Amino acid sequence: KLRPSNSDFSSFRVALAGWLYNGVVTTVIDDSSYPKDGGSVTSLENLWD
Amino acid sequence: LVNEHSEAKDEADEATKKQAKDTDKSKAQVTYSDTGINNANELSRSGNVDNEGGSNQKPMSTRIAEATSAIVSKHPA
Amino acid sequence: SSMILTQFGPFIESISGITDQSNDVFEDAAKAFSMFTRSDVYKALDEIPFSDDAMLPIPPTIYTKPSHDSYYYIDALNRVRRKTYQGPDDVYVPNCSIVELLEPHETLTSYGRLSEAIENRAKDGDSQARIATTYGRIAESQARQIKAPLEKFVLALLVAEAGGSLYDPVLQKYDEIPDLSHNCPLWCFREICRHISGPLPDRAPYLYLSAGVFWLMSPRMTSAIPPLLSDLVNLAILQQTAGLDPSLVKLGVQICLHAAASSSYAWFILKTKSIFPQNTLHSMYESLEGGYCPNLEWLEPRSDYKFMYMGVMPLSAKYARSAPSNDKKARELGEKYGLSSVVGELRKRTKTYVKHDFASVRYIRDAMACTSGIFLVRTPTETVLQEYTQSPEIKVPIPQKDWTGPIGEIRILKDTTSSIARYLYRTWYLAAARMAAQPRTWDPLFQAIMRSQYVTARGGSGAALRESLYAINVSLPDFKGLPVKAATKIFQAAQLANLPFSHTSVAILADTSMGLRNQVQRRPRSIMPLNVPQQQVSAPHTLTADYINYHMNLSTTSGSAVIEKVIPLGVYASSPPNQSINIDISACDASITWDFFLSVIMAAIHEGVASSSIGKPFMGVPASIVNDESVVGVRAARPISGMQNMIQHLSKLYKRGFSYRVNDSFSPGNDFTHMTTTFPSGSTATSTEHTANNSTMMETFLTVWGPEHTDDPDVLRLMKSLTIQRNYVCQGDDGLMIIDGTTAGKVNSETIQKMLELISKYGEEFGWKYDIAYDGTAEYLKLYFIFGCRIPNLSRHPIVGKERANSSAEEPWPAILDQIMGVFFNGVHDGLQWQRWIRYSWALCCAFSRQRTMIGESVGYLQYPMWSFVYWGLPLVKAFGSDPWIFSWYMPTGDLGMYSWISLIRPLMTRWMVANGYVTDRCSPVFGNADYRRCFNELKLYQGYYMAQLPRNPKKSGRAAPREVREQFTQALSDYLMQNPELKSRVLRGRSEWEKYGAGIIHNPPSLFDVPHKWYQGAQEAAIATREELAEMDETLMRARRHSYSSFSKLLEAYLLVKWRMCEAREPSVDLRLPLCAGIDPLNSDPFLKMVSVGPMLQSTRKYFAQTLFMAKTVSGLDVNAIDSALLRLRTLGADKKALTAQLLMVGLQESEADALAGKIMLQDVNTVQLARVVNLAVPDTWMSLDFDSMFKHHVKLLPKDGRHLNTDIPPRMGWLRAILRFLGAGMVMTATGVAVDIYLEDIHGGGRSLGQRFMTWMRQEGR
RNA sequence: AAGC
RNA sequence: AUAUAUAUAUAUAUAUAUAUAUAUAUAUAUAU
RNA sequence: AUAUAUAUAUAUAUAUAUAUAUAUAUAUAUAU
């Protein structure tokens, strides 16, 4: 789930950068990051999500 | 220059072989080695150890020569 | 290649899985095959564009060879002998030029035979002529050791490989076997043939015919060429069929070329036969990384050879190779013959493998397959003068002060003796005592069986018997005008029918004729064919040895067929941490003489029989009186039993020696008599006696001598931990020692080495040369195991080679088909790539399916349709529009396989048949509305099916013979067989009872009265056939082919009424990543899948089938299976127990146990395998190496999966159908390609009762 | 001549 | 078939240490 | 003093375990 091999972290820096411009930019978590179809506690993958 | 334990064992084996030869058989019926007795501590005289308890890694005369040659002085320049 | 594709477009496309097979295309290809010529085949060879990698130098030395004069000389006995230049063994055919001895053949001026004029001076008595003719005849014999002209095999290979790579239906890809452009052996073959032929327009270096061989007149022809060509063609076939690595094939070719360039090809091959084993198998896994080793367990009693499979154990560096390194020996051997390079690359390649997987075993198998496979040939005179001229070296003999006075010929051995012979004497003493006490020994039927055992249709040196009897003025009946061979032991028995033993006593001291057999990678073997009285008097020896082998030791009785041996023993012994020791006795027969062995065994047997046998005759031999001198001073007389009389006479014979008669057909003026002490090889007591002495000596070493001759405590502990009943298995001169791995790993190799030295020393003082191998590998009966994986030896199944030892011409045409099918099955067992092998087998079957015949201006062609081969067990490729490569050669033979493949493809067959206009209106239970009755006739399928069952050998029966002489022969045979009146009365009672009750139910009741007729027929069939019998063959086959049929046999029609239902696959039997048989790997899908789905047969077959019969042994001439089938037929058809009693009485069983067994059989329930024999259903020979029993029991469900159906009901008293239908299910499941599948019965068209009635009808009607 |  | 993300496999490249055997020198026994 | 066998020191040669990184293609999934 974490995929450590990936080497892109623009999201992390952008999250910090957004703090200065709270008044015009609203940073939210993309909906694709949420558990699929609401998920369930019976699924390990959903738990990790 | 062998370990005294080792020479004791080898020397017993030699005796067993000589006994076998005397009896004119492939085996010696009477053996001095591989008996039931655990004679592990048995020692035998060897040329490995001098009279001082030191090792004979170097001959005694050689030690004397090296010791006495470290003090000699020669004619002045 | 253009003409190849032009001629065989349709055939290649059919047999390569592109188009449906058909009879007409097959026959067209057969005609094309028949229409080629030799030079045409070579011109076809010229068109292959060989690549650079297939290039290698050829030394010029092969073509230029000296004359044969310096290699022969004449001894002081005026006998031609071979001059030896390389040592005592350089007695094989030298490599010399021949062309200067050839007379040109008429109409074939380019070819010729040995000069007839030289033959004339040879028969006159000239020396040089005799030398020349000996050389010529022996060269011809060496060149005649093939099955058929090599051009047939080469052309068939070309046709098969013209189809390109094959598509794998399981792997869903294409194989990557390199094409002919990388086949080095073919390039070498073409180049050498072209260089020999040169400018002359004919290309064949020689011509192989039935009458012999004709040589091409070239100044570069050499006697060594034919074997070289045979080896090259074998290697070329093997590389293309089994996907061998070309690098190793090049090394094999190099070895062959070096052999050719030497002074003697055969001698060179013999001296260098072990490079590949010693460099790959015996030096394997020096550094080990990983892999799997099977976990097997040896249960109790170990006498039962019961092993059970557990699983896999990961390997580790702890179990690397630990045997002594053989690098120095291998390098020395390679240097001594100038092959140090080949050894270098072999070792370098071997070091590269660190894991135990499919790859390593495949590499080992490929390396072993590259050894030459010729039949070594040498003149009989040198064989006799080399093999019978060595004697045992009894380094420590029995003291002369340890014997008693003589009892006739024997001499009793004292018990105070310091020699080790005392234990041998005691063992044979107890063996004889236990043997003689068995009541079955005195049963007349047992003695009759033993008497009949050695009465066979094979030679017995009857002539020497004849003058030996004439030496005392006794005249035997001549049987003038009998169309049978007088040179058979049946003829000897007929002539010896009514003579007293006192009259035939002198016959044992007669001479012995000659007999030879050639082997692969082994010197030719000689045989002494003992005559009838000798076989009769040799009985007690055989009985005692049989008792020892049966009870007091571990000893097998399996044959040389790979299926019947004990694979579990080898696989268990090779697997770590167990270690194996390979022990063989060099020149075993020559090492057993009167000096040490015979003088003890004979005395022991004679003494250990007197009590349980006093005053009784035996085998026709009566009691007698002998002088007694055992005790000092007192010299008296003593009665002895019949066995003791035989022992006295046999002791006389053993003390004297043996008188071998030689008649060298390849050498004019080379015939004489040789006095020898070598133990005979042709007697019935050879193997059993050798095994018994092997076991006894091994036990004596392990118990007394060995413990008393070594002092190292580790060796003492090891030896005290070993016993023969637990660790040693012997058979003849071959033996195997198993060292069980300890709980701390495996036994230290140094201890094993010192023990081996002890055995080597111990063998010498009684003149036994122990050939001992300890290299981390297990070998038994020429089966090779490493780390629990068996390695098939391809080189010992030559594809083209055939053993011919005599000068007789070869066989008529149809016989070769049996050899071809045998080659196919040998390839099946050896585990070749199945698709390529099937394609190549089809090519050969096509190439040999046509034959010209002359019927007196009626010039016709004999042609076998493709279906006859299928009936003979060769699987199809693609037909009736079906998918290609859907059948497996685990297909059964005969009716079973036919039924199986029809059942698999019935619907497609019906749709195909309808779509082609073969439409009718009468709906059929099997084929619906298909007009099969005509399509099968025109497709010749009926014709092929029916002619595949005709006897393809000439039937010498029916020859004209006078009534008086024939009846005299028969009555003489019967009188010889029926000695004791009790047996005759038993048989008469049986006949009367059978007429009372069993008459009319079956038409062929086996009986002892039929043995003389069968013996006469067998003797008559042994004679040489003549031309009109061959014409009888031809007209019979034409009659069968031209006829039209309407149905198969009743049995097959009954079988087709049954249909099944396939289901989910089985469960894996073994781990998928464990190598078991080399080559059976994922690149060899179908065998691999069948093996992992069914599982290997983990129990020896001889013991398994020992319990599938009622009578263990019967009289020679009758078949136990026939008797069992008759009994079960009688029981099934409702005959009462008195009929079975009568039947048992005919075969001579005594009345009481006859009744007991009859009742028991009537009420008993029998096994599936035993019960299925009523309809001649036998387990396919290819299934023997698989666990078919469990699949019979728990994977052929006779109840439909969805529940009980109306038609699948078995009538209560017809339970044997339960046995039959299991075979049908087995055939259906095994024929299909892929994994084994659980199968359920589906429906029987007519219901169970109708099927039972049809089967009973067939059972009653057969035998008419 | 050509075994078990 | 095209594009993207995740993973397996082959090939090329790089280092240390140790042990075994052989040979030379010295000696004992037998032989010269 | 020399040769064969055995032992020690020294030198040379030979043999051997394990590990790490990137791209493409391929496989799986998504979109057309």
UniProtKB/TrEMBL annotation, chain C:
One of its GO terms (molecular function) is RNA binding. The keyword Cell division does not apply. The keyword Hydrolase does not apply. It comes from the Viruses. Its EC number is 2.7.7.48. Keywords: Nucleotide-binding, Nucleotidyltransferase, RNA-directed RNA polymerase, Transferase, Viral RNA replication, Virion. Its main location: virion. One of its GO terms (biological process) is viral genome replication. InterPro entries: DNA/RNA_pol_sf, RdRP_5, RNA-dir_pol_reovirus. PROSITE patterns: RDRP_DSRNA_REO (PS50523). It is found in: Virion. GO terms for cellular component: viral nucleocapsid. It holds the Pfam family RdRP_5. Belongs to the reoviridae RNA-directed RNA polymerase family. This is RNA-directed RNA polymerase. It comes from Mammalian orthoreovirus 3.
